[PDB]
Design a protein around this ligand. Sequence first.
Ligand SMILES: [Ca+2]
Ligand SMILES: [Ca+2]
Lengths: 395, 401
Amino acid sequence: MLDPLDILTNIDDVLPYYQAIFSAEEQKVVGYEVLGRILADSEIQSLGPFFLDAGIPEEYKLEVDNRIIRQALDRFLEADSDLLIFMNQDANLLMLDHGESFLELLKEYEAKGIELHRFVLEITEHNFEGDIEQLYHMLAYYRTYGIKIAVDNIGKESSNLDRIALLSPDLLKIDLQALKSPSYEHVLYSISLLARKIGAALLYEDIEANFQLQYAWRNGGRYFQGYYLVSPSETFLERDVLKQRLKTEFHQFITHEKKKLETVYEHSEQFYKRVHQAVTSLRKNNLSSDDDFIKKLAEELTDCSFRIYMCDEEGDQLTGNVFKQDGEWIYQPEYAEKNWSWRPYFLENIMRMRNLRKGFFSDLYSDLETGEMIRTFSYPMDDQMYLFIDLPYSY
Amino acid sequence: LDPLDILTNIDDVLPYYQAIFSAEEQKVVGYEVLGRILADSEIQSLGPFFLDAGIPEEYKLEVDNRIIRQALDRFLEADSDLLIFMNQDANLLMLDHGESFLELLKEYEAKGIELHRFVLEITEHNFEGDIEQLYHMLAYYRTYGIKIAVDNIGKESSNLDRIALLSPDLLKIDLQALSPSYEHVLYSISLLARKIGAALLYEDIEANFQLQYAWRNGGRYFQGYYLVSPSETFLERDVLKQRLKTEFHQFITHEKKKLETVYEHSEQFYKRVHQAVTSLRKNNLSSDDDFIKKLAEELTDCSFRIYMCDEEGDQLTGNVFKQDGEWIYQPEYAEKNWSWRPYFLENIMRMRNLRKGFFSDLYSDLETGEMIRTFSYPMDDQMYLFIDLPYSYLYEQDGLI
Ligand SMILES: [Ca+2]
Ligand SMILES: [Ca+2]
């Protein structure tokens, strides 16, 4: 293994390697991440341990860091003009002089021909121990030159979504070693939606396998990185190196998700028919009690439902719950006179049921009482009343 | 108050209680136990005392105990279904892997407080031990029915990973913090809370607008001075029922309206677009790219980008993009794919089935960076038209922001 002294003594042997990043739009190389390499003893080894070592003085990190960047940016001057240049930069070291010296190094290469808006700067926020509002201040300055900001390692140690969103980054880098909790896609889904509202694109990294790439794609992944794509190498690659492979790999993701979306919408339709038949059959009868009715319905729909109740237009529960437990139905009258408009989507679905004049399923959510994952089916009725049915699973 | 003052007069220490209110029944669901001492003809908080890092842990637990015993003695006599919210530091609890505390709880089960009424307010970002061990221990607690609530969610603790791991029963979000970054981050936590099954409890509600924010963003439970301040005794369970019933009626009414105003707006826009498109599409043998140019001029007042895609998200045309009040044509976006975008495929099969067009929620455009909405409109030949709306049009319409 490599002692730090070994590196500073042979500083002329240090070189950048590059890892390509691929777009979901054009399935093409959109830019590269600059990584640090040294030629020691007929072999190439990473300067990672060297940059990550807290024991090594900062100037020697910057000393080396510099030659790699110069070599890397010298290379970019000659490649395609629209390539992005992703660069790892510690917040604290960058903040030693409020980023002054670094920016001048970037400014230098603008003159030499690299537009500043090609620079993506990989910052790790939870590593920062200075005043966060000051770091956020500085990056503002950077952006006013078009410089892009990417935040690393989301959700690991001191990571913080409040502090991240304040930074209002251009990119979020999410690594998927995490995928090797079954419920991690909830994490991913949540992230993308936060990212969509503040306008940060998602870059998934450390993609070592296919299922990982699929996870990336179907959870809002705009850009992609990993060994499974292309490993870091000393030179650049043909921009459309993986185009056909990704085109086909993505076609298959699309097909899957559609077969997936249609299959659930189709299922919803038939269920609406089953419910419509059941309800109108029962509703032509002398069951004035709104409560008598849902009991009958539950027996009708015994195979697929586990809870049923009715509410009015403003979310007030008109009836009490029928609840299936241990294969038997129980009547819980106490649940009458409760309001549910506070629930996400609830009011939205009321006006949807009206306008659309049909019934439908919700997405998957975790029922507050039982705890297991369920879906609710909402069905509109005569007299501006709305029926709710709770369904567990059927995969 | 010096800490010595407290330990010296430990017999003067007493719990106060703050009630917590349900959105369902607008009633008192339980109380948070808070720590107080009677010093010099007056009542003052032991907060500073529990938060002081200088004070040895034994003396914090010594006092803590006096309060919990008094508090739980009180609960033995109140209603049987009341929840008991209790502040507990992770690190002090982890000094003996929670063994002693649990035995204290176990004791009161015998005396008549079934364990599922206990909510344990933990602050995860204060923990400096191995997280997976703390997560390990709380599992044990839960297997007795003990409930777990995490504190300072939203700001100080905002780790979708940890939240997803500790898999808590409750998230406590405080609203002194009160769209900004902050409101979008609660959004993403909200979305998760419903997926992992954690109820939202909003606290530090000092005003009405705060309560409304709480309500419309998935708040199941509520706390603050604006509701009821802490006091040394319990309150009648339906103390605020009618006040909250009416205060919530007004939130419901409001939301039924902000939502209609946007759906109404969508309908008319669909008509405008339908008229424009079919006018331009009838007697035209010019290409799809030529068409969208004409359309952008048609819709010049309200659009800023227009393009078409096929059923699998491949962009059929270039873009027309309005810039500095002029329309530019961007051939480069031809043959780009967008199915990776959230909602994209979902909306294709929605446009088909429903056979109509509609707006998206508000999102931040990746190029311009301002907040926009997109309108999706289905066409003949299994093709789909998209139109990105600027803020300048959203801002001066009714309730699209
Ligand atoms: Ca990196
Ligand atoms: Ca608390």
